[PDB]
């Protein structure tokens, strides 16, 4: 539970600075054509918020990328590519730490058992003789 807690924090930080990168990436070379929302790195948060809000308003910018930077198909695929690669693993990573706990515990539960049945079998003999 608390073990995996730190794991996501560093990953989200990777993701945070993955943002800082893609913000530094996007802003510079996507502005001057449609520079209302591509001046500041803030636009990447917007871009997040955009994606959170299922933008389809960069569809506009995508029409503008078809007019201005068709490469942006990549630099839209990029935001999509970067997000999934990030968010899944941070989740999977935790799925794993979630799935990793119980298997030990299952064996942990079975751990105490075999010895008990043995610790049982041992004193079980001590009556038919003593």
């Amino acid at each position: 539970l608390l073990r995996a807690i730190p794991g996501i924090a560093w990953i989200a930080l990777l993701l945070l600075v993955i943002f800082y990168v893609f913000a530094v990436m996007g802003t510079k070379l996507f502005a001057q054509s449609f520079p209302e929302w591509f001046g500041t790195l803030g636009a990447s948060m917007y871009t997040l918020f955009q994606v959170m809000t299922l933008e389809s308003w960069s569809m506009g910018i995508a029409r503008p990328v078809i007019e201005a930077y068709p490469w942006a198909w990549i630099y839209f695929v990029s935001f999509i590519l970067v997000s999934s690669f990030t968010v899944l693993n941070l989740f999977i990573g935790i799925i794993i730490e979630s799935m990793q706990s119980a298997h030990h515990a299952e064996d942990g539960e079975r751990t105490d058992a075999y010895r008990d049945e043995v610790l049982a079998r041992l004193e079980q003999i001590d009556q038919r003789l003593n």
Partner: antibody
Framework: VQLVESGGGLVQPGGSLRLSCAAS????????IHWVRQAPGKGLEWVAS????????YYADSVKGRFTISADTSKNTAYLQMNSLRAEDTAVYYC????????????????WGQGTLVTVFN | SDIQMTQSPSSLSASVGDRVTITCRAS??????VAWYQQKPGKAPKLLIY???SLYSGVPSRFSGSRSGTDFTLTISSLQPEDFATYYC???????????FGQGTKVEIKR
């Protein structure tokens, strides 16, 4: 709230009239105002849009440059100079705020301006 | 980008109390941020439906708008005194190149 719609009238071609829009019961400075003309027996035509906090030079292809819309925050006042009329643009024009600011809708027409009838042919 | 809010039908004559649906077709991927408004003749715009569902503060419940991707449709079931009306959509970008409002739907009262 109240929208100030004035500066209409009849004129001849090549003429340039400045359609004034002053802010009343709303901070335009954060808001954004758009202009759209209703031809007789026709619907709206989203002309332009703007301080929009940031200075959004936003205007439709129909009057692309032929008109230039702006505003004075200091007076809570806006303007729309439709130059170069053509008479094609002869239609009753009303300016309003679909503002993405603090005081208006953001979703659409927060209100409607009184509208002043412009007849550009003599 | 480009937008062409094709509203239908042309002539819409109906009796009072009846249920009426004003439909509009989107050219490209128009989002949830759809707007429709109705105004009496020589009367100011009245924003009807905000975000394609939200009635403006004071807007009666008598009318409502639905979304079906490309198809966006407004509907009213009970004729209000404002029976005779018009209907045009409005397609928005949060802040982007394309701006468009509807080609208009004449809502006539059939006598």
């Amino acid at each position: 709230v109240q929208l100030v719609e004035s500066g209409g009238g009849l004129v001849q071609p090549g003429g340039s009239l400045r359609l004034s829009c002053a802010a009343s019961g709303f901070n335009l400075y954060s808001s954004s105002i758009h202009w759209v003309r209703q031809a007789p027996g026709k619907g709206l035509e989203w002309v332009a849009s703007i301080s929009p906090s940031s200075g959004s030079t936003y205007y439709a292809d129909s009057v692309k440059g032929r008109f230039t819309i702006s505003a004075d925050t200091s007076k809570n006042t806006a303007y729309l100079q439709m130059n170069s009329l053509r008479a094609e643009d002869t239609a009753v024009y009303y300016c309003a705020r679909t503002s993405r600011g603090w005081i208006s809708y953001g979703s659409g027409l927060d209100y409607w301006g009184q509208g002043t009838l412009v007849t550009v042919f003599n | 980008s480009d937008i062409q809010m094709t509203q239908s039908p042309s002539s819409l004559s109906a009796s009072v109390g009846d249920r009426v649906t004003i439909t509009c077709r989107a050219s490209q991927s128009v989002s949830s941020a759809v707007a429709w408004y109705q105004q009496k003749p020589g009367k100011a715009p009245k924003l009807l439906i905000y975000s394609a569902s939200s009635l403006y503060s004071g807007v009666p419940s008598r009318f409502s708008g639905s979304r079906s991707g490309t198809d966006f449709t407004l509907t009213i079931s009970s004729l209000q005194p404002e029976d005779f009306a018009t209907y045009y959509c409005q397609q928005y970008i949060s802040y982007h190149e394309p701006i468009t409002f509807g080609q208009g739907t004449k809502v006539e009262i059939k006598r």
